[PDB]
Each structure stands twice: as C-alpha cells, then as structure tokens.
Design an enzyme around this catalytic site. Structure first.
Site, PDB file in Angstrom:
ATOM      1  N   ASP A  93       5.017  86.628  -5.956  1.00  0.00           N
ATOM      2  CA  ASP A  93       4.503  86.379  -7.298  1.00  0.00           C
ATOM      3  C   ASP A  93       5.395  86.969  -8.386  1.00  0.00           C
ATOM      4  OD1 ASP A  93       0.878  86.542  -6.653  1.00  0.00           O
ATOM      5  OD2 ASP A  93       2.469  85.264  -5.841  1.00  0.00           O
ATOM      6  N   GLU A 134      -6.388  81.237  -0.827  1.00  0.00           N
ATOM      7  CA  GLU A 134      -6.788  81.167   0.578  1.00  0.00           C
ATOM      8  C   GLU A 134      -8.213  81.672   0.833  1.00  0.00           C
ATOM      9  OE1 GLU A 134      -3.386  83.665   1.529  1.00  0.00           O
ATOM     10  OE2 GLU A 134      -2.412  82.002   2.552  1.00  0.00           O
ATOM     11  N   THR A 174      -1.169  78.561   6.321  1.00  0.00           N
ATOM     12  CA  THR A 174      -0.020  79.032   5.548  1.00  0.00           C
ATOM     13  C   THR A 174       1.060  79.926   6.167  1.00  0.00           C
ATOM     14  OG1 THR A 174      -1.262  80.895   4.621  1.00  0.00           O
ATOM     15  CG2 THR A 174      -1.406  78.784   3.468  1.00  0.00           C
ATOM     16  N   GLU A 199       2.228  75.530   5.914  1.00  0.00           N
ATOM     17  CA  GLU A 199       3.310  75.927   5.013  1.00  0.00           C
ATOM     18  C   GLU A 199       4.012  77.105   5.671  1.00  0.00           C
ATOM     19  OE1 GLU A 199       1.248  77.637   1.748  1.00  0.00           O
ATOM     20  OE2 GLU A 199       0.376  75.772   1.007  1.00  0.00           O
ATOM     21  N   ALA A 242       5.298  80.895   5.360  1.00  0.00           N
ATOM     22  CA  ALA A 242       4.820  82.022   4.570  1.00  0.00           C
ATOM     23  C   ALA A 242       5.888  82.627   3.675  1.00  0.00           C
ATOM     24  CB  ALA A 242       4.240  83.098   5.483  1.00  0.00           C
TER      25      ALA A 242
HETATM   26  O1  LIG Z   1      -1.834  85.792   1.450  1.00  0.00           O
HETATM   27  C1  LIG Z   1      -0.446  85.653   1.222  1.00  0.00           C
HETATM   28  C2  LIG Z   1       0.266  85.518   2.581  1.00  0.00           C
HETATM   29  O2  LIG Z   1      -0.015  86.710   3.386  1.00  0.00           O
HETATM   30  C3  LIG Z   1       0.623  86.780   4.700  1.00  0.00           C
HETATM   31  O3  LIG Z   1       2.049  86.946   4.601  1.00  0.00           O
HETATM   32  C4  LIG Z   1       2.472  88.206   5.120  1.00  0.00           C
HETATM   33  C5  LIG Z   1       3.590  88.011   6.163  1.00  0.00           C
HETATM   34  O4  LIG Z   1       3.055  87.361   7.291  1.00  0.00           O
HETATM   35  C6  LIG Z   1       4.156  89.344   6.663  1.00  0.00           C
HETATM   36  O5  LIG Z   1       5.270  89.041   7.460  1.00  0.00           O
HETATM   37  C7  LIG Z   1       4.530  90.301   5.504  1.00  0.00           C
HETATM   38  O6  LIG Z   1       5.758  89.967   4.921  1.00  0.00           O
HETATM   39  O7  LIG Z   1       3.462  90.370   4.497  1.00  0.00           O
HETATM   40  C8  LIG Z   1       2.959  89.120   3.952  1.00  0.00           C
HETATM   41  C9  LIG Z   1       1.767  89.443   3.031  1.00  0.00           C
HETATM   42  O8  LIG Z   1       2.191  90.141   1.885  1.00  0.00           O
HETATM   43  C10 LIG Z   1       0.257  85.543   5.592  1.00  0.00           C
HETATM   44  O9  LIG Z   1       1.080  85.504   6.744  1.00  0.00           O
HETATM   45  C11 LIG Z   1       0.430  84.201   4.793  1.00  0.00           C
HETATM   46  O10 LIG Z   1      -0.176  83.177   5.549  1.00  0.00           O
HETATM   47  C12 LIG Z   1      -0.246  84.257   3.361  1.00  0.00           C
HETATM   48  O11 LIG Z   1       0.010  83.095   2.597  1.00  0.00           O
HETATM   49  O1  LIG Z   2       2.047  78.268  -5.245  1.00  0.00           O
HETATM   50  C1  LIG Z   2       1.173  78.317  -4.136  1.00  0.00           C
HETATM   51  C2  LIG Z   2       0.704  79.749  -3.871  1.00  0.00           C
HETATM   52  O2  LIG Z   2       1.875  80.527  -3.525  1.00  0.00           O
HETATM   53  C3  LIG Z   2       1.699  81.962  -3.262  1.00  0.00           C
HETATM   54  O3  LIG Z   2       0.839  82.229  -2.143  1.00  0.00           O
HETATM   55  C4  LIG Z   2       1.296  81.685  -0.921  1.00  0.00           C
HETATM   56  C5  LIG Z   2       2.112  82.766  -0.106  1.00  0.00           C
HETATM   57  O4  LIG Z   2       3.169  83.298  -0.897  1.00  0.00           O
HETATM   58  C6  LIG Z   2       2.669  82.138   1.204  1.00  0.00           C
HETATM   59  O5  LIG Z   2       2.407  83.051   2.228  1.00  0.00           O
HETATM   60  C7  LIG Z   2       2.019  80.755   1.544  1.00  0.00           C
HETATM   61  O6  LIG Z   2       2.622  79.873   2.515  1.00  0.00           O
HETATM   62  O7  LIG Z   2       0.559  80.738   1.293  1.00  0.00           O
HETATM   63  C8  LIG Z   2       0.099  81.184  -0.045  1.00  0.00           C
HETATM   64  C9  LIG Z   2      -0.629  80.005  -0.675  1.00  0.00           C
HETATM   65  O8  LIG Z   2       0.125  78.818  -0.481  1.00  0.00           O
HETATM   66  C10 LIG Z   2       1.084  82.642  -4.488  1.00  0.00           C
HETATM   67  O9  LIG Z   2       0.851  84.001  -4.191  1.00  0.00           O
HETATM   68  C11 LIG Z   2      -0.242  81.920  -4.858  1.00  0.00           C
HETATM   69  O10 LIG Z   2      -0.769  82.502  -6.017  1.00  0.00           O
HETATM   70  C12 LIG Z   2      -0.012  80.381  -5.083  1.00  0.00           C
HETATM   71  O11 LIG Z   2      -1.264  79.734  -5.259  1.00  0.00           O
END
Ligand SMILES: OC[C@H]1O[C@H](O[C@H]2[C@H](O)[C@@H](O)[C@@H](O)O[C@@H]2CO)[C@H](O)[C@@H](O)[C@@H]1O
Ligand SMILES: OC[C@H]1O[C@H](O[C@H]2[C@H](O)[C@@H](O)[C@@H](O)O[C@@H]2CO)[C@H](O)[C@@H](O)[C@@H]1O
EC number: 3.2.1.2
Length: 490
Positions: free
Chosen positions: A96, A181, A337, A375, A377
């Site tokens: 973000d 989510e 995600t 998606e 992550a």
């Molecule tokens: O809710 C945002 C995002 O959270 C998780 O991502 C993790 C990632 O898996 C870790 O490897 C590490 O880098 O911290 C991240 C959270 O700050 C979820 O895996 C993901 O699905 C989700 O979008």
């Molecule tokens: O722009 C979509 C979404 O992106 C970010 O959250 C992601 C996260 O960074 C990833 O882990 C991912 O694959 O899942 C989340 C939702 O797609 C932003 O943090 C979020 O505010 C924004 O809606």
C-alpha cells in the site's frame, strides 16, 4: 480445440489511479500503459472502486465522475474490467503506497463510538474496516453497515449502467474486509505485526463481545470468556496457552469460540453477497469474493495464523470448503489471493505450506462446483513464479481432446507498474500470458473458450449454517502435476 484450455489473464491497475480527491490524475500516462497490455494479449484489468473516495462528502453523496472517465478509457483500449467494491482503507497493508481512508463521515461517528472498528485484546482499534459487529446496527445516520454497502453497489449499477450493458465489466469483486478480503485483520503491519507472527483475534469490540457472551450463555457456559492466552501478534504458537499442544484451542471452550469466530465471517459474506446479488440482478456480470492465503503455520497442527484470521482450518476440519459451499448459492467466484508461492521460498521456521494450501482451497471449490480464480500475493517477475501460477491454473495440464478436467476461471496479476513494462520483465510476462492462453492468440470473445457471461440470476435459497458446516469434512485434494506442461522457460 486448444482454445478450451484458455485461462484469461487480468492485470491490477496502480493503487490511486483516481486520487483521494476523486480525480483521474494521469489519463495519458495510463493510456500508454493500457495500450501496452492490449498488445501483449492481456484480457482485462482490475481496479479498486474506493468507498472512501466516492461517498466522501456524506451519506449517499456519491460522485462517480472520475471513475466513469477511467472506465471509458479502459473500454477504448479494448480491455475488460474486474471492479472491486472497495469498502476498506488503503495504507496499512503490504504494498500500500497510498493512503485512502473509508468515508470521513463514518470516521466521525467512530470518534464517539470506537466499537465500530475491529478491536484486539489490548483495546487498539483498527480503522481500515467496519467490524462485522455493526453489520446490522442502524447507527450510521439511520443506516446499518450492510445497508451502506448495499446502497453503494446499487448506485454503482445505476450510474454505470451503460458500461455494464456494453459488457465492459466481467465481474464484481465485493470487498468483505481488510484488503477487500473476507477475513479479520489479524496481522496488521500498522500495529507492528511482522511475518510470520501468528497474529491476534479481533473480536473484542463491544458488539462482538456481547454476541459471544450471549452465545456461550445459551450454550450453557455463561462463564466462558474470549481468549486470554493466545499471546500477541508476533508470537510463535508453542509459546501460547491457546495454540500449544493440548492447548485451549482443543478444549470444548476453544472449539466453541473458534466456531463462533469463523461463523461470523461466513454470515458476514453471505448477507452482503445477498445484497450484491440484488444490486446487479439481471446484469451480465459475475460476483466474486477474495480469500486470503495464510500459508504460515499451515504445516503445524494448530494452523494458528489461519485461526486468528477467521479461517477455522485444521488437519481434521476443512475451514475453506464451507466458504465455497456458501458461494455456490450466489453462483460466485472464489478468488484466492496467494497463487505464486512455493514452499521452498519460505523460511523454514515459518512452517509455510503455500503449495498445499492452494491445492486444498482450489480442490474445495471445484468439489463444491463453483468457479475458482486467483492472484499472486507479492510482486514477481521471474519465470519460476509464472510457472507456478500456470501450474495452479491447470493442475493436470492441457487437454488436446477438449477442456481440461480442472482449470481456474481466471488469474489477476499484481500489479501494473513501470517495473513490469521494463523490456526484459515485460518480455517474460508476454510468455506467461501466452502460456495461460495455452499457446493461443488473445481471444476477444469469451464464449469461444466457454466463458460466456449470462444475466446474473437471483441467489438460490439460504443454506442453513449446519449444512454449510458439513463441508468441514476433510477430503483428499485432486492430483497436481509436479510441474506445468506449459512452462515459460528462462
Ligand atoms: O491480506 C494481504 C495479503 O496477506 C498475505 O500476504 C503475506 C505473504 O503471504 C507473506 O509471504 C508475507 O510477505 O506477508 C504478507 C502479508 O503482509 C496473503 O498471503 C495474501 O493472500 C493477502 O492478499
Ligand atoms: O488493488 C487490489 C488490492 O491490493 C492490495 O491487497 C492485495 C495484496 O497486496 C495481495 O496479497 C493480493 O493478491 O490480495 C490483496 C487483494 O487483492 C491492497 O492492499 C488492497 O487495498 C487492494 O484492494
């Protein structure tokens, strides 16, 4: 025909493409980028439709102008769109780079009633999303949180009718919590959380606490209290009384709490989805929700991180299939995600099983006969990541004699950036798109690869919680290939 193995590829637009002041900042800049994607074969893009930007002025004070201009440009560039009803704040989560709060007028109410926010045991309020606790509390100038989300989506439908009718929008992703989510904000970076902390339960606001207390009284144990031995954000499971071997999570009290805690999310998503279905009834679009991929601690019996996030998933209790079954009555897509990670890429002390988690979640969806999407992550530009995504998109490879027995409904790539368009990075990306498309050229008409979208039908009858929880019965996942038959190479 090979075209039946085709899996569409979408790309997320930059965060803040329309700023907090509701201004579509750089149309010309985005246009050049969009044209690049079109030439690369990308099917469409994904964008956050921020609630905090649109209904900023006050209740029902919507301004859709900037977003109409964006959608107009996306359409001119020949791309489809996945619109996210973003009822959350941008800023406190990974990646973000911009701050976008929820409506200031809602925040004002939060000044006098701090219990509208998710609250942890220490009393810290998280302002990125309204606690499920106020879903049906008419405390927002006469409206309940769900009525706010409902009115918002209806206004979107009416004000964007021309785009919906022209078929620009492929699906509507309904935000259901932090980062859009369906989960509790158990791992808040803003509060000092750090991977791979187990996180903390977020059920201490006065509304959830009161609901819990009433619930345990009805169960015959009015003396039961919310967890007080689950440790803190950055703890390890074995150092807590709740998650250690033979700990509280295994007791009758713990099991009751966990069921209650996870059931709140199921009902949260189910009720808002009911509203989303009404708002877009008849429109040629599909509904989708996002499920976070919490792979850390997945390899230990307690699955601590998942539990604190609201996913009551254990080795003998499937905490994800119940979500998939809930989605079936809404004919909704389950967007997972976290699709690009391999177990070996995680520090060993995090006990991460992203590969096994993916197989469990996707299998559950196909088992329940719903559409599954995903998606990546984190930002990735290497072939290993792409090959892993392609493997999960078609677990058993391509079928030269028709459609594959198993395939994802689509994959959205995070995110559009200058790094992605860099010559070498973009070169590899093009191959990724080609392989997702199963070596076929970009296909404009979705009907050709069996993705025709029909008018959204009303949701099927409500499925009682008991029937939903029958899906907790553990099942063996479908067989996965060790590596994709459609590698990107290099
Ligand atoms: O809710 C945002 C995002 O959270 C998780 O991502 C993790 C990632 O898996 C870790 O490897 C590490 O880098 O911290 C991240 C959270 O700050 C979820 O895996 C993901 O699905 C989700 O979008
Ligand atoms: O722009 C979509 C979404 O992106 C970010 O959250 C992601 C996260 O960074 C990833 O882990 C991912 O694959 O899942 C989340 C939702 O797609 C932003 O943090 C979020 O505010 C924004 O809606």
């Amino acid at each position: 025909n090979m075209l039946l193995n085709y899996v569409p590829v979408y790309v997320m637009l930059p965060l803040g493409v329309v700023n907090v002041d509701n201004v579509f900042e750089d149309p010309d800049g985005l246009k050049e980028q969009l044209l690049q994607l079109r030439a690369a074969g990308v099917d469409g893009v994904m964008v956050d439709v921020w609630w905090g930007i649109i209904e900023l002025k006050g209740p029902k004070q919507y301004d859709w102008r900037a977003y109409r201009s964006l959608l107009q440009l996306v359409q001119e560039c020949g791309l489809t769109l996945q619109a996210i009803m973003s009822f959350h704040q941008c800023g406190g989560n990974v990646g973000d780079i911009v701050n976008i709060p929820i409506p200031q007028w809602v925040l004002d109410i939060g000044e006098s009633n701090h219990d509208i926010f998710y609250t942890n045991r220490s009393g810290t309020r998280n302002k990125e999303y309204l606690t499920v606790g106020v879903d049906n509390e008419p405390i927002f100038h006469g409206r309940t949180a769900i009525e706010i989300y409902s009115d918002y989506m209806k206004s979107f439908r009416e004000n964007m009718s021309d785009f919906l009718e022209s078929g620009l929008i492929i699906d509507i992703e309904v935000g259901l919590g932090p980062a859009g989510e369906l989960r509790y904000p158990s791992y808040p970076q803003s509060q000092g959380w750090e991977f791979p902390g187990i996180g903390e339960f977020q059920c201490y606001d006065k509304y959830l606490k009161a609901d819990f207390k009433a619930a345990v009284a009805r169960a015959g144990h009015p003396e039961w209290e919310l967890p007080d031995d689950a440790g803190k954000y950055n703890d390890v499971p074995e150092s807590t009384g709740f998650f250690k071997s033979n700990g509280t999570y295994v007791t009758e009290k713990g099991k009751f709490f966990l069921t209650w805690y996870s059931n709140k999310l199921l009902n949260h998503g189910d009720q808002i989805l009911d509203e989303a279905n009404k708002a877009f009834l008849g429109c040629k679009v599909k509904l989708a929700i996002k499920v976070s991929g919490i792979h850390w601690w997945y390899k230990v019996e307690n699955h601590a991180a998942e539990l604190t996030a609201g996913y009551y998933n254990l080795n003998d209790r499937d905490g994800y299939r119940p979500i998939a079954r809930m989605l079936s009555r809404h004919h909704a897509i389950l967007n997972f995600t976290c699709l690009e990670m391999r177990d070996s890429e995680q520090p060993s002390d995090a006990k991460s099983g992203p590969q096994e988690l993916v197989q469990q979640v996707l299998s559950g969806g196909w088992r329940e006969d719903i559409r599954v999407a995903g998606e990546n992550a984190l930002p990735r530009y290497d072939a290993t990541a792409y090959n892993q995504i392609i493997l999960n998109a078609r677990p058993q490879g391509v079928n030269n004699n028709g459609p594959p027995k198993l395939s994802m409904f689509g994959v959205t790539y995070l995110r559009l950036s200058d790094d992605l368009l860099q010559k070498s990075n973009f070169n590899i990306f093009k191959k990724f798109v080609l392989k997702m498309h199963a070596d076929q050229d970009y296909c404009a008409n979705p009907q050709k690869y069996n993705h025709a979208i029909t008018p959204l039908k009303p949701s099927a009858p409500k499925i009682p919680i008991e029937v939903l929880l029958e899906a907790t019965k553990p099942t063996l996942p479908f067989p996965w290939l060790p590596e994709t038959d459609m590698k990107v190479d290099g």
